[PDB]
């Protein structure tokens, strides 16, 4: 009523016995596992984490030395809190800048809430960052503060939890929390970490999150170990606005102490158990007293108990204490797996409590989450981890998870691969070491994951952080091959649509069918046909990628490639692009067979010097695509003369087979007619960043008019300079849209010369088998870190609890202690 209802959209835990997830916890509670043991010989009873010092510092951008100096408590909160965010189905990168509050509890050794601050900084969120000492308060205090923070609106999302790490009200000499059993030995300390992800219910429902349960209300109180705590329950119930008779479960403090259990059982009897049997449980029978994590851990049990119909049994119980036995309470301790009491069409409700030594008593009232009621095509399954080793473990764990279900006597129904892909692609964060399996069924997906796990498939190290689209590289002539467009025309509707639109346009200009050329049993050959056909594929590829949610962050053209680059960037209409490429080639026909071109293995500046010192002016620099390779062009006799001069000197120089010696003086006699033919162009500003290989400065303003295309044909192809500029502006993923990669190596050579990292890919290659169209290409780009709007491929789907990525853990501890 009074306070706003809070939805629990996600939760994570790091607990003894390698229980590192809600599902693992649920199964453990059903088996009735006792995690209390003797003291380990690594550091009389207690439940301990396998390695509380384990941490993945590089993932958070911290050095090993600093991480070693950081409190192990803080490190556990960081990783556990991160898991709680991803378990909510939230890409943690998406939280940046949001009003996300952080409320953590721990034991401290002029107030600096550093532990919560680390989490806030790691997520790049703004909002309250509060820590609390659970010796000066309760372990539910953080969760209480989080709910009121949401209510007051100072937070829109809230991470709430606690952690306990043992560094060595009396104790149980047997070493067990016997609950409210007549045994009543005492309690036992324990380690653990739990974090809840909270959001206002109305926001959760609106944003379409998966609600685990609802916190209707909470309350805190000061006791100057008391019976007057009876009011604390009423305060919470009043804030929650619910009758206690409707509460069929109470995860009590359940310390198992002689003085506190009857005292607690007595105060609970006043409020709960009036009508119907209300279960009374304590997870401390399983995990002992996890201190600051006990409250959150208790909630996690209640939430899980609310989701399923069953209630997990308490351990170490046989008989109530004779003193508190004769009361007419419906309260009963579960000894086995007990179904949920009420069938009166009321949502299941539970309550949790936790009392501090200082007399701080906190109580919370919960309710179950609101109810909300062809095949064969391949899907992309993004899988990543902070390291190659971690990815192999991750792939293995996901594979086992898939194989665990899909079986009778297991989770009966098969895991929906459509929802899984949706989860991994849209409801998860992406990490450094990446892979992306392509599969249309479970079998091929498992095999794909095995290959990763067994070290057969190698991971891609992302070179950028999914913040920008890739660079489309448009190459020139010479990539064509027989029936190069055939398979994509059948497999990529967007590719076929783009070609279908181009078909009549190119026909009107050049009088031939581009579709026919792309499906012919022989490679396209005619001067009139080759470049327009290549241009068509390039535009079609870009359209197909856009239909998969991949838009370029920039474009770079090479010679004729600049035409498609101009269209894709929006500088020229589709119609004008056709006019340019078609009318160019029609005029270039007039000079076919004149002049020659040759590749020489020298830097452009050296070549330019030798041409000048030798008085050569009928041969010029035609292409500078790499810092160590140059193409010259001009008079046939002069070119072949230079080749021999270089060859005899030990320099590799090889003539290139070309119809037209473009980018040389040989194209002069058609430039005027070209300029006249392109008089009617209507260019616009490019919407995508465009690095020109025509202009003497790749960042300069391009007009894309008649004179620009004249210069594009006549002047040097400065591809290397354009790639350099793109790298300087932060672009890292380069992908060639063409029938076959002609420029991927030149790009690499340019990047290497500048000591610049990058990832280069090819959309198509000669005789490539493409049964899944360009989805493999999409997968590779994402794995490199290129931005991909996965809402296109996966507009809708259900959130699945696929295992969270394995961490890259290294044991970090300060010496001498």
UniProtKB/Swiss-Prot annotation:
Stretch list, region Linker domain (LD): 370-467
Lipid attachment residues per UniProt (N-palmitoyl cysteine): 13
Leader sequence residues: 1-12
Domain Ketosynthase family 3 (KS3) stretches: 13-368
Effect of deleting the gene: Disruption of this gene abolishes the production of both 2,4-dimethyl-2-eicosenoic acid, a polymethyl-branched fatty acid (PMB-FA), and lipooligosaccharides (LOS). Complementation of the mutant with the wild-type gene fully restores the phenotype.
Residue span of region Acyltransferase (AT): 468-767
Cell compartments where the protein resides: Cell membrane
Free-text comment on this protein's domains from its UniProt entry: Is organized in a condensing KS-AT and a modifying DH-PsiKR-ER-KR region, followed by a flexibly tethered ACP domain.
Subunit structure: Homodimer.
Protein name: Mycocerosic acid synthase-like polyketide synthase
Annotated organism of origin: Mycolicibacterium smegmatis (strain ATCC 700084 / mc(2)155)
Segment of the intact protein contained: 4 to 887 of 2111
């Amino acid at each position: 009523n009074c306070v706003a209802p809070v939805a629990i959209i996600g939760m994570a835990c790091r607990l003894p016995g390698a229980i590192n997830s809600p599902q693992q916890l649920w199964e453990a509670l059903l088996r009735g596992d006792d995690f209390v043991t003797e003291i380990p010989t690594g550091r009389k009873w207690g439940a301990f984490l396998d390695d509380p010092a384990a941490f993945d510092p590089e993932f958070f951008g911290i050095t090993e030395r600093e991480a070693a100096a950081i409190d192990p408590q803080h490190r556990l909160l960081l990783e556990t809190a991160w898991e709680a965010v991803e378990h909510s189905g939230l890409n943690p990168a998406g939280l940046a800048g949001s009003a996300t509050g952080v409320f953590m509890g721990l034991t401290h050794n002029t107030s600096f809430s550093l532990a919560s601050g680390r989490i806030a900084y790691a997520l790049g969120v703004h909002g309250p960052a509060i820590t609390v000492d659970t010796a000066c308060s309760s372990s539910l205090s953080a969760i209480h503060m989080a709910c009121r923070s949401l209510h007051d609106g100072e937070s829109d999302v809230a991470l709430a939890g606690g952690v306990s790490v043992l560094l060595e009200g009396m104790l149980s000499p047997t070493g067990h929390c016997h609950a409210f059993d007549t045994a009543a030995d005492g309690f036992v300390s324990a380690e653990g970490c739990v974090v809840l992800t909270l959001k206002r219910l109305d926001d959760a429902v609106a944003d379409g999150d998966r609600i685990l349960a609802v916190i209707r209300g909470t309350a805190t109180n000061q006791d100057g170990s008391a019976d007057a705590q009876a009011k604390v329950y009423r305060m919470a119930l009043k804030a929650a606005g619910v009758e206690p008779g409707t509460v069929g479960l109470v995860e009590a403090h359940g310390t198992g102490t002689p003085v506190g259990d009857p005292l607690e059982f007595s105060s609970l009897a006043e409020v709960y158990g009036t009508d119907g049997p209300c279960a009374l449980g304590s997870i401390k029978t399983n995990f002992g007293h996890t201190q600051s994590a006990a409250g959150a851990l208790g909630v996690m049990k209640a939430v899980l108990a609310l989701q399923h119909n069953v209630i997990p049994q308490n351990l170490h119980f046989t008989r109530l204490p004779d003193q508190m036995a004769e009361i007419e309470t419906g309260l009963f301790v579960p000894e086995t797996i007990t179904p949920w009491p009420v069938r009166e069409g009321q949502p299941r409700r539970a309550a949790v409590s936790a009392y501090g030594l200082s007399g701080t008593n906190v109580h919370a009232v919960l309710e179950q989450a609101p109810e909300s009621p062809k095949a064969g095509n391949a899907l992309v399954f993004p899988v990543s981890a902070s390291s190659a080793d971690a990815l192999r473990s991750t792939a293995q764990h996901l594979a086992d998870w898939l194989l665990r279900s899909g079986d009778g006597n297991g989770r009966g129904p098969a895991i929906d691969l459509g929802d899984l892909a949706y989860t991994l692609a849209r409801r998860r964060g992406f990490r450094a070491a990446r892979s992306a399996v392509l599969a249309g069924d479970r079998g091929t997906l498992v095999e794909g994951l095995r290959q990763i796990a067994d070290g057969e498939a190698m991971p891609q190290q992302a070179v950028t952080n999914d913040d920008r689209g890739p660079v489309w590289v448009f190459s020139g002539q010479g990539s064509q091959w027989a029936s190069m467009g055939a398979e994509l025309l059948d497999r990529e509707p967007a590719f076929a649509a783009a070609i279908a639109e181009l078909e009549p346009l190119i026909a009107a200009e050049s009088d031939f069918s581009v579709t026919e050329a792309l499906t012919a049993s022989e490679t396209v050959t005619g001067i009139d046909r080759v470049q327009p056909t290549i241009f068509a594929v390039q535009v079609a590829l870009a359209a197909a990628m856009r239909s998969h949610g991949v838009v370029p962050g920039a474009v770079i053209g090479h010679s004729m490639g600049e035409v498609a680059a101009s269209v894709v960037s929006g500088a020229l209409s589709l119609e004008d692009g056709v006019k340019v490429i078609c009318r160019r080639t029609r005029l270039m026909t007039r000079i076919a067979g004149s002049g020659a071109m040759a590749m020489v293995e020298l830097p452009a500046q050296q070549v330019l010097s030798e041409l000048a010192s030798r008085g050569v002016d009928d041969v010029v620099l035609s292409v500078v695509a790499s810092p160590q390779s140059t193409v010259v062009g001009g008079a046939t006799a002069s070119v072949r003369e230079l080749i021999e001069m270089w060859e005899s000197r030990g320099v590799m120089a090889r003539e290139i087979a070309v119809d037209v010696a473009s980018h040389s003086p040989q194209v002069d006699p058609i430039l005027d007619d070209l300029i006249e033919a392109l008089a009617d162009l209507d260019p616009a500003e490019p919407e995508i960043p465009y690095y020109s290989a025509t202009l003497y400065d790749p960042r300069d303003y391009a007009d894309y008019d008649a004179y620009y295309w004249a210069d594009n044909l006549r002047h040097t192809v400065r591809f290397s300079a354009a790639v350099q500029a793109a790298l300087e502006d932060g672009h890292r993923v380069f992908a060639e849209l063409s029938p076959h990669p002609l420029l991927t190596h030149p790009v690499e050579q340019t990047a290497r010369s500048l000591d610049m990292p990058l990832a280069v890919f090819a959309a198509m290659r000669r005789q490539q088998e493409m049964p899944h169209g360009l989805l493999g290409f999409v997968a590779d780009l994402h794995s490199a870190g290129a931005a991909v709007d996965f809402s296109v491929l996966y507009p809708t789907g259900r959130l699945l609890d696929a295992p969270l990525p394995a961490w890259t853990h290294s044991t970090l501890l300060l010496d001498r202690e």
